[model samples]
Target: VKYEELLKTLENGINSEEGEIRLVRKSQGRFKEEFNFDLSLGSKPLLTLKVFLGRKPYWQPWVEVFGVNPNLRNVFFGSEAERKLYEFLSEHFGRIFVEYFEDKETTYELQKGVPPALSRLGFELLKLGYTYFRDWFIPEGLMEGGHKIQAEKPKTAEAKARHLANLKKEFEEFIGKCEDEGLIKKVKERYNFLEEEIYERCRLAAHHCIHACERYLALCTESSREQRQHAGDCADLCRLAALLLERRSPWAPAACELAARYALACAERCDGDEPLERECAGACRRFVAACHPL
Candidate 1:
């Protein structure tokens, strides 16, 4: 068979529904094996990899592999070299495949090359997810803990600005405290190269939140479509800023944490039927789940 026909055959053989992958087999010499991989959304998103290796006489549930042993499970291997190859393939596929998989949301239903920025950010986000799940708050404890309603928010732009200014000051003070206590340096010792970059992003996110509050000042006398559009812009920026902070800074001050919640509420109000708004809403919800206080 031609190469193009083989590619077409493989594409047709594999099926997906709601982003779930299913692989079917055909007569020998006419089919190719495939897999469907997914990254679950969370503080530490689960990376699931499933591969189809022809047909089995019996059906079995998928088993999670905590460790790989070629000596006991080498169905397709013919020699030690091939077993080594299998281990190598399994090891490298995750890092490389994830680069492409992470781009699925934006690069969906299209055949194209990904930009460097997307690839870089995608990997960084994946790393952040892993780090968050491993080193952040304990999940079981958090589940048992609950938070009470704090206070009603300000109604006017001036009130919001005053509140946000206070929050910004508190966040800065917290950073200084962390530095003075050598907590920042301790984290740096562990995080190494990622420390500075992630901290910078967190700082930038806080700044963006402050600016977002300033932008809300426009809503005080907003009477035009342009002013409404300005509100949407501010909301989007605020939501993104929150996301930036949540990604790497798991142990932020309450001031920054509340700022993120405020940003989410603002984004919800400005978002009606737009896709961007929906995206922000989803992200904000995730951030709240992972970063919100108890």
Candidate 2:
């Protein structure tokens, strides 16, 4: 059998510890010259040693499908020292066998000469997905718990800046209107009570949005590369911040309505026929109706 098919064969034989040991050696190699004197080299040897001791090929999911021996798992993957080495190479190992199992084609002609950049991009995507789900969605859920209306939003830099400025302005102005309408003292007292309870939550959402925008601005100044790369995600985060801020703010009811409008504007800019666009259109229409009660 060809060495090219070693990965596929290894996948079938993974249930056996002996099969894993065989593939580990077969998959092994020296680190790049640039890393010769680096701290990574020390761990590289340990990693290779662990691989031989039943680390298995990367194709099998370590946590889910592939169960590492509870006792030996600490020696190989759990210890802080050995873990670094495995982290560096786990995705790389997985890529080779995964492609091989799927019978995927490669641009490279050589067995181990796949471009390092491709592997790096794959790693980044995994990290990005984890963050998007863990950080963004969790806060979004919490905001929904505290605020009555949590709308979907457009994702972009321009939409976000406009939303923030508009939100603050409208809310302040709405509070002033309520005061002029002889409801000032009552509304003010209610707002004071709401603020006492929800101030920290509202502040957290605003501070996060503001910070993300600031970071986006810094990245934009550095290179168009970043702006083009991350503009979509930045836009979305901005829209979210605005939605939560408006919903939780203690300003007059009219102010809440305008805050919702800023959220819709953000949605409009995210106007692809995708999920973002649908969300923006619906939120904008609803907020507009909410602003003018019959």
Candidate 3:
């Protein structure tokens, strides 16, 4: 049967003692379709059939026929008509779903005896809370009836506050867990202000001493050559020790110890009559003295 034929059959009207029960076509797609019985006549959905057509490797359609099934239990609170009408709906929805794929006859009338059956227990199902719309058929325009009528309640100030407090507690808890496990000691270093001054003092002296060696050693002699060599070595060692200590490396103590020895050796050579040599000697002595910690 064509999908529209099923629509025509479902919407066919029959009047009951309460009123004329209308099985309105809520929505339809190429693959899925839905319908609800209107009541109160704001007509909250009392009964519904959310049917989905399935075809992948096999052609079949499934029915989510959600409603109160007619049984011994319901008939006490309701009537025999209520029982039979829902019984017919539940059974026929499944039957029609299966038959639609199997009985492919366009010339045939689409009547599977649904309209007369739907007209069985009209407004009684409304009280059954057959508001079976659990937000299922979302893409359908007609599926918004009951919710659109109620325009339902939203979160309050207390609800918002409660969640925010709960969210913060979880946030801090997660951060505490990560920090406790994360590497704190290995990646950390204590910044020493005095060490920084020592590094700068050594740095300035190393450069200045090298400049003096360049001038005095160029105007050549054996002692000048020896002094130049010692000055160059001292300058390099000073910078290397500074680098190791700056990063707080385990090797810094050993490197600083060697650098101190080199500083004094350079100091001995640069201890001279010239004012520049005297200044260079002073810087070297200061560097050697700073090596006390290492």
Candidate 4:
């Protein structure tokens, strides 16, 4: 099945549904569900887990299947006519995700299905936000008391504000969920923001930053060794901060603080540890001190 088309059709089916009924058609494998429903509908079958979970059932692919069979909740979706049609269509009807980012070659264990994969990646991305800024803005230049702070900064203030607001809103929405009450269903939305969106974005950003830093670090032979070292440190802190921020906003301060520290540290690493280093360190320190509460 064309993954792209499958995603689009599923998206329509899920969004088109009225009321609390969420349709979770099978994807990726053959439909091994015990019930022998009519297969004539092809990929557009109107199967609802509303029959299983009461109320406006939040759509979670695994949970819907698990509710039906706890042990063998998800089975491989084959490419049979009905199965492929259903999986293909169902792919788009619900929350969409790109697994290629989170599923790296090094850590195969990290692949915890699509939903969990997204959630974990989101938190990771938030923690690594600092790295995003470090790569884009740090090596370039600081605005240096200019009113154009946001304009000069990497990962512009507007972008940070938007992403942070999104993270806060998602975390707040699920602040009080318990595991006993449909853990998967309850935390589904919140988890997706942290895992899929946040993680995927941050991972890409961090990877870019790290690569840039590596290129610069090797150039230490031509430039100040200290500058390259601090640049390296800044990159590390940014990655760490992105992950923490993904989980909670309060930690963003620390992430910012580390970023500032890296800036100062880099200044000191420059030629002869001059007053410029002190000045640079002071600026970053001030930035971190001012924004620690945020």
Candidate 5:
């Protein structure tokens, strides 16, 4: 079957209440395609099939299929439908890396099911929060605070209070939407947990930002290379702290990965520069390692 045919079949399956499909594409080309599906009418995602259309060694197209949580479980493509679909994708895309299972019990169970209601709700909220911040909020320039302080020396006391309050208010409004959808109980149960986690992230981010500001001020007074090095260290800390804040507030694995990346990059840049840099890099490596299990 071709892409169109496969889509038709998939649509049919969806219409029959088998699942819902979300086609995530990069550009008009099918070079990068992500097929996200929630097998039932609930919030939990049942299957995700990511395909990269290209040839790489034995595999003409690279494919990774996961059932439910990617970190928690892996599902082998099984059954005639799966095989046919994989073959169709392979034929069109060129290469296929198919991981199959002889004992299909594990795959079947994972494919057809998911976590508890509250866990699933939390997962959905995290995704929603992550997407909201990443796409809209982050892009709108909230994350960029580099030269603002230098130009204006930060905000007035009342202005700063309103500004910070506005942030929390907006976040609360977002949370309110989720709760209004009759998920009040579940959301309430998870509220303090999410709030505490997000607060911790924000606290750390602010701490680092303050340190950066201090270092930046020091740059004006001290004209030494050592002082400049501290500036770099502060910048790295602030960036990493921001990533950590994003990761927790939105609870996105992508943000966590980015944090890891930034941490490592800073570590590499500061390897021979300063003790703080080395310490920061080590700390970053540790954060990445911790995020692996999540």
Candidate 6:
């Protein structure tokens, strides 16, 4: 009940749906303008809406729902709860958010607010995050954050850039690797444990299923559009989960869940077709069941 009036006012404007809000003051401003919102529950917020303003000056003011914190968080909104918050922000903040094209680039740079745009019922925006903004490829200390210019990055964004780059390679070799002589057996010899099984299944989904879906799509034997759509998506997600697990990236489990989800959706559409499609359906199901263990 502390900032009841402020909360109500914000609900009317920024939080148009007036959904659940947990507010905390994050900055030591005399006026208490700097705050963060808990849009969803957990010890740490997966999605945080950052609010900071001017005079409180020198740093330009703006409200940002997202910036560069991939390890602290990554944009994962396929789950029911993740979808809930994603829908909320994507709704209230119309300029942001889009259909999940697996958008490699997020457009938030134009959000930093100038004096007039930094206040109640108004304002503009300039830039800066607690870490870095879009171009995390920038070098240390060369990157600047102010509100105060403290630049400390334990997680380098270029690694993600490289991960994304190599994933293209994953697809090229995705199916091809199975054909390559003596790979998984060598992996088995190296790991000597449960990790080998996961690699086998992930590569199974990443390989067999992707190749199945690819062939199914190219033929025009009365295929449904969503079947095509879901098939491509399954290939992408399964392939992603594979290398993420192989590289032991922290995001593997989430990607595995997503891969399973997409593969199942693909199976539904594939179930509606000829023998080829039916086989594809089985392939999709195989991947789904395989990914589910993770």
Candidate 3 lDDT, 243-267, residue by residue in tens: 7766767787688789888778988
lDDT of 1 by residue, 1-294 (tens): 233343353344322221321223222322244444332211222233443343344521121111112222232112333233224333222222221222232222112222121222222322332211011112346421111101222334345345435543543454454423443343233334444444455455445444444444343443345535544554555455555555654444454466556556655664444444444444444443333221
Q: Given candidate 1, what's the lDDT at residue 223?
A: 33
**Among all candidates shown, the one with the greatest lDDT:** 6
lDDT of candidate 1 at residue 286, scale 0 to 100: 42
TM-score of each: 0.27, 0.19, 0.29, 0.29, 0.26, 0.34
Candidate number with greatest TM-score: 6
| lDDT: worst 10-residue window of model 1 | 143-152
Q: Could you tell me how far off, in angstroms, the CA of residue 248 lies in candidate 1 after the best superposition?
A: 12
Better of 4 and 6 by lDDT: 6
Give the poorly placed runs of model 4, Cα more than 4 Å off. 1-187, 235-257, 260-294
Error of model 5, residue 110, in angstroms: 20
Note the residue pairs that clash in candidate 1: none
Once superposed on the true structure, which residue ranges of model 1 sit more than 4 Å away at CA?
1-188, 192-252, 274-294
- Cα TM-score of candidate 1: 0.27
RMSD (CA, Å), each prediction: 17.9, 22.2, 32.7, 18.9, 17.5, 17.5
Clashes of each: 0, 5, 0, 35, 2, 8
> Least lDDT summed over 10 consecutive residues: which range in candidate 5?
145-154
The regions of model 5 sitting more than 4 angstroms off are 1-48, 51-129, 133-183, 216-294
Model 6 lDDT at residue 116: 13
Output the worst ten-in-a-row residue range by lDDT, candidate 3.
Answer: 145-154
Per-residue error for 55 in candidate 3, Å, reads: 99
Candidate 5, residues 4-118, lDDT tens digits: the string is 6545544554321322333332223333344433332223444555444443564444444433333222322223334334444433542222222222432232233311112
Estimate the lDDT of model 5. Answer: 0.39
Screening candidate 3 with a backbone cut-off below 3 angstroms (N, C-alpha, C), the clashing residue pairs are none
